[PDB]
Amino acid sequence: GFWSSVWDGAKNVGTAIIKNAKVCVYAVCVSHK
């Protein structure tokens, strides 16, 4: 299910990026907003 792999896949995809690229702050010592 795409609608299912979209929330589960992304959730793990993003959380992972930070898991290894855990910068001082959320993004990179800055804010995207």
Side-chain angles (χ1 to χ4, degrees):
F2 167 93
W3 272 129
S4 211
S5 29
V6 79
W7 305 129
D8 175 58
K11 177 145 202 296
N12 210 103
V13 159
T15 193
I17 300 151
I18 297 83
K19 243 55 132 167
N20 282 245
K22 52 243 202 304
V23 201
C24 40
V25 91
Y26 313 96
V28 181
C29 269
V30 305
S31 48
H32 271 239
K33 207 158 263 281

Short mmCIF file of all heavy atoms in Angstrom, two decimals:
data_model
loop_
_atom_site.label_atom_id
_atom_site.label_comp_id
_atom_site.label_asym_id
_atom_site.label_seq_id
_atom_site.Cartn_x
_atom_site.Cartn_y
_atom_site.Cartn_z
N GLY A 1 0.81 -1.21 0.00
CA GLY A 1 0.00 0.00 0.00
C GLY A 1 0.84 1.26 0.00
O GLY A 1 1.56 1.53 0.96
N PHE A 2 0.75 2.03 -1.08
CA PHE A 2 1.52 3.27 -1.20
C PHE A 2 1.22 4.21 -0.04
O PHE A 2 2.13 4.68 0.64
CB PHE A 2 1.19 3.96 -2.53
CG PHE A 2 1.68 5.38 -2.59
CD1 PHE A 2 2.93 5.67 -3.13
CD2 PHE A 2 0.90 6.42 -2.13
CE1 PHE A 2 3.38 6.98 -3.19
CE2 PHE A 2 1.35 7.73 -2.19
CZ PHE A 2 2.59 8.00 -2.72
N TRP A 3 -0.06 4.47 0.19
CA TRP A 3 -0.48 5.35 1.28
C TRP A 3 0.08 4.87 2.61
O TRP A 3 0.19 5.65 3.56
CB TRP A 3 -2.01 5.42 1.35
CG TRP A 3 -2.59 6.48 0.46
CD1 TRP A 3 -3.60 6.32 -0.44
CD2 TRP A 3 -2.21 7.85 0.40
NE1 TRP A 3 -3.87 7.52 -1.06
CE2 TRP A 3 -3.02 8.47 -0.56
CE3 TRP A 3 -1.25 8.62 1.07
CZ2 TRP A 3 -2.91 9.83 -0.88
CZ3 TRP A 3 -1.14 9.96 0.76
CH2 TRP A 3 -1.96 10.55 -0.21
N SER A 4 0.44 3.59 2.68
CA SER A 4 0.98 3.02 3.90
C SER A 4 2.51 3.09 3.90
O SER A 4 3.13 3.31 4.94
CB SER A 4 0.54 1.56 4.05
OG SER A 4 0.42 1.20 5.41
N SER A 5 3.11 2.91 2.73
CA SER A 5 4.56 2.96 2.59
C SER A 5 5.05 4.40 2.53
O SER A 5 6.25 4.66 2.63
CB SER A 5 5.00 2.20 1.34
OG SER A 5 3.99 2.23 0.35
N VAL A 6 4.12 5.33 2.36
CA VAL A 6 4.46 6.75 2.29
C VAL A 6 4.73 7.33 3.67
O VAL A 6 5.64 8.13 3.85
CB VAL A 6 3.34 7.56 1.61
CG1 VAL A 6 2.21 7.83 2.59
CG2 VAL A 6 3.89 8.86 1.05
N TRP A 7 3.93 6.91 4.64
CA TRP A 7 4.08 7.38 6.01
C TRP A 7 5.14 6.58 6.75
O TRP A 7 5.93 7.14 7.52
CB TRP A 7 2.74 7.29 6.76
CG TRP A 7 1.63 8.01 6.07
CD1 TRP A 7 0.40 7.50 5.75
CD2 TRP A 7 1.64 9.36 5.60
NE1 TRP A 7 -0.36 8.46 5.12
CE2 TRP A 7 0.38 9.61 5.01
CE3 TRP A 7 2.59 10.38 5.61
CZ2 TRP A 7 0.05 10.84 4.45
CZ3 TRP A 7 2.26 11.61 5.06
CH2 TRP A 7 1.00 11.82 4.48
N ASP A 8 5.17 5.27 6.52
CA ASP A 8 6.14 4.40 7.16
C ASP A 8 7.52 4.58 6.55
O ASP A 8 8.52 4.65 7.26
CB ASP A 8 5.70 2.94 7.04
CG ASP A 8 6.73 1.97 7.58
OD1 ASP A 8 7.10 2.10 8.77
OD2 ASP A 8 7.18 1.09 6.82
N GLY A 9 7.57 4.64 5.22
CA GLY A 9 8.83 4.81 4.53
C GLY A 9 9.48 6.15 4.83
O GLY A 9 10.66 6.21 5.18
N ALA A 10 8.71 7.22 4.68
CA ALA A 10 9.22 8.56 4.94
C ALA A 10 9.63 8.73 6.40
O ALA A 10 10.69 9.27 6.70
CB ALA A 10 8.18 9.61 4.56
N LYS A 11 8.77 8.26 7.30
CA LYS A 11 9.04 8.36 8.73
C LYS A 11 10.42 7.80 9.06
O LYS A 11 11.17 8.39 9.84
CB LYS A 11 7.97 7.61 9.52
CG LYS A 11 8.22 7.59 11.02
CD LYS A 11 6.92 7.65 11.81
CE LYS A 11 7.14 8.16 13.22
NZ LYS A 11 7.99 7.24 14.02
N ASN A 12 10.75 6.66 8.47
CA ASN A 12 12.04 6.02 8.71
C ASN A 12 13.13 6.67 7.86
O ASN A 12 14.29 6.75 8.28
CB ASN A 12 11.96 4.52 8.38
CG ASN A 12 12.90 3.70 9.23
OD1 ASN A 12 12.49 3.04 10.19
ND2 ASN A 12 14.19 3.72 8.88
N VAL A 13 12.75 7.14 6.68
CA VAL A 13 13.70 7.79 5.78
C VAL A 13 14.24 9.08 6.39
O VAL A 13 15.45 9.30 6.42
CB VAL A 13 13.05 8.11 4.42
CG1 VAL A 13 13.83 9.20 3.70
CG2 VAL A 13 12.96 6.86 3.56
N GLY A 14 13.34 9.92 6.87
CA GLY A 14 13.75 11.18 7.47
C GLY A 14 14.49 10.98 8.78
O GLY A 14 15.62 11.44 8.93
N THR A 15 13.85 10.30 9.72
CA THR A 15 14.46 10.04 11.02
C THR A 15 15.87 9.49 10.87
O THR A 15 16.73 9.74 11.71
CB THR A 15 13.61 9.05 11.85
OG1 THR A 15 14.05 9.05 13.21
CG2 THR A 15 13.72 7.64 11.28
N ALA A 16 16.10 8.75 9.80
CA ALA A 16 17.41 8.16 9.54
C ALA A 16 18.42 9.24 9.15
O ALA A 16 19.54 9.26 9.67
CB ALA A 16 17.31 7.11 8.45
N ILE A 17 18.02 10.12 8.25
CA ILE A 17 18.89 11.20 7.79
C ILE A 17 19.49 11.95 8.97
O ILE A 17 20.68 12.28 8.97
CB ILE A 17 18.13 12.19 6.89
CG1 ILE A 17 17.58 11.48 5.66
CG2 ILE A 17 19.05 13.34 6.49
CD1 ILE A 17 16.33 12.11 5.10
N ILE A 18 18.66 12.22 9.98
CA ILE A 18 19.12 12.94 11.17
C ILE A 18 19.91 12.02 12.09
O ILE A 18 20.84 12.46 12.77
CB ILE A 18 17.93 13.53 11.95
CG1 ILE A 18 17.20 14.57 11.10
CG2 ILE A 18 18.41 14.15 13.25
CD1 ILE A 18 16.19 13.97 10.15
N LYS A 19 19.54 10.75 12.11
CA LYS A 19 20.22 9.76 12.95
C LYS A 19 21.72 9.76 12.67
O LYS A 19 22.53 9.56 13.57
CB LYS A 19 19.64 8.37 12.71
CG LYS A 19 18.97 7.77 13.93
CD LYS A 19 17.91 8.69 14.49
CE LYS A 19 16.61 7.94 14.78
NZ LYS A 19 15.67 8.75 15.59
N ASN A 20 22.09 9.98 11.41
CA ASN A 20 23.49 10.01 11.01
C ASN A 20 23.98 11.44 10.83
O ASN A 20 25.13 11.75 11.14
CB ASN A 20 23.68 9.22 9.71
CG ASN A 20 23.70 7.72 9.94
OD1 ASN A 20 24.72 7.06 9.72
ND2 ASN A 20 22.57 7.18 10.37
N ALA A 21 23.10 12.30 10.34
CA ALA A 21 23.45 13.70 10.12
C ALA A 21 22.91 14.58 11.25
O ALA A 21 22.49 15.71 11.02
CB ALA A 21 22.91 14.18 8.78
N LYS A 22 22.93 14.05 12.47
CA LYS A 22 22.45 14.78 13.63
C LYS A 22 23.28 16.04 13.87
O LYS A 22 24.27 16.01 14.60
CB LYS A 22 22.49 13.89 14.88
CG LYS A 22 23.85 13.24 15.11
CD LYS A 22 23.76 11.73 15.03
CE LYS A 22 24.91 11.06 15.76
NZ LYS A 22 26.23 11.52 15.25
N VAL A 23 22.87 17.14 13.24
CA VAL A 23 23.58 18.41 13.38
C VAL A 23 23.20 19.10 14.69
O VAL A 23 22.21 18.75 15.33
CB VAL A 23 23.28 19.35 12.21
CG1 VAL A 23 24.36 20.42 12.09
CG2 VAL A 23 23.15 18.56 10.91
N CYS A 24 24.00 20.09 15.08
CA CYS A 24 23.75 20.84 16.30
C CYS A 24 22.26 21.11 16.48
O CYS A 24 21.73 21.02 17.59
CB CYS A 24 24.52 22.16 16.28
SG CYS A 24 24.51 23.00 14.67
N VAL A 25 21.58 21.43 15.39
CA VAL A 25 20.15 21.71 15.42
C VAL A 25 19.39 20.81 14.45
O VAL A 25 19.99 19.99 13.75
CB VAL A 25 19.86 23.18 15.07
CG1 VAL A 25 19.62 23.34 13.58
CG2 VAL A 25 18.66 23.68 15.87
N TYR A 26 18.08 20.97 14.42
CA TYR A 26 17.23 20.17 13.53
C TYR A 26 17.88 20.01 12.16
O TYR A 26 18.29 18.91 11.78
CB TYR A 26 15.85 20.81 13.39
CG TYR A 26 15.24 21.23 14.71
CD1 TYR A 26 15.36 22.54 15.16
CD2 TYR A 26 14.54 20.33 15.49
CE1 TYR A 26 14.81 22.93 16.37
CE2 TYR A 26 13.98 20.71 16.70
CZ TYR A 26 14.12 22.01 17.13
OH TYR A 26 13.56 22.40 18.33
N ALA A 27 17.97 21.11 11.43
CA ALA A 27 18.57 21.10 10.10
C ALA A 27 20.09 21.13 10.18
O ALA A 27 20.74 20.09 10.26
CB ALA A 27 18.05 22.27 9.27
N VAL A 28 20.65 22.33 10.15
CA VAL A 28 22.10 22.50 10.23
C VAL A 28 22.46 23.84 10.87
O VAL A 28 22.87 24.78 10.19
CB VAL A 28 22.74 22.43 8.83
CG1 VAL A 28 24.25 22.58 8.93
CG2 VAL A 28 22.37 21.12 8.14
N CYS A 29 22.32 23.91 12.19
CA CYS A 29 22.63 25.12 12.93
C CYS A 29 21.83 26.31 12.39
O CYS A 29 22.20 27.46 12.60
CB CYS A 29 24.13 25.42 12.84
SG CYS A 29 25.11 24.68 14.19
N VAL A 30 20.74 26.01 11.71
CA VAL A 30 19.88 27.05 11.14
C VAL A 30 18.43 26.60 11.08
O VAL A 30 18.06 25.58 11.67
CB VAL A 30 20.34 27.45 9.72
CG1 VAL A 30 21.81 27.85 9.73
CG2 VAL A 30 20.10 26.31 8.75
N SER A 31 17.61 27.36 10.37
CA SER A 31 16.19 27.04 10.23
C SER A 31 15.73 27.21 8.79
O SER A 31 16.02 28.22 8.15
CB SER A 31 15.35 27.92 11.16
OG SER A 31 15.73 29.28 11.04
N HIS A 32 15.00 26.22 8.28
CA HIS A 32 14.49 26.27 6.92
C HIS A 32 13.25 27.15 6.83
O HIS A 32 13.00 27.79 5.80
CB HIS A 32 14.17 24.86 6.42
CG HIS A 32 15.33 24.18 5.76
ND1 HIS A 32 15.29 23.73 4.46
CD2 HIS A 32 16.56 23.87 6.23
CE1 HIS A 32 16.45 23.17 4.16
NE2 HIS A 32 17.24 23.24 5.22
N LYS A 33 12.47 27.17 7.90
CA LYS A 33 11.25 27.98 7.95
C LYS A 33 11.55 29.44 7.66
O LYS A 33 12.35 30.07 8.36
CB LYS A 33 10.57 27.84 9.31
CG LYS A 33 9.07 28.06 9.27
CD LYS A 33 8.38 27.41 10.46
CE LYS A 33 7.82 26.04 10.09
NZ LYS A 33 6.54 26.15 9.34
#
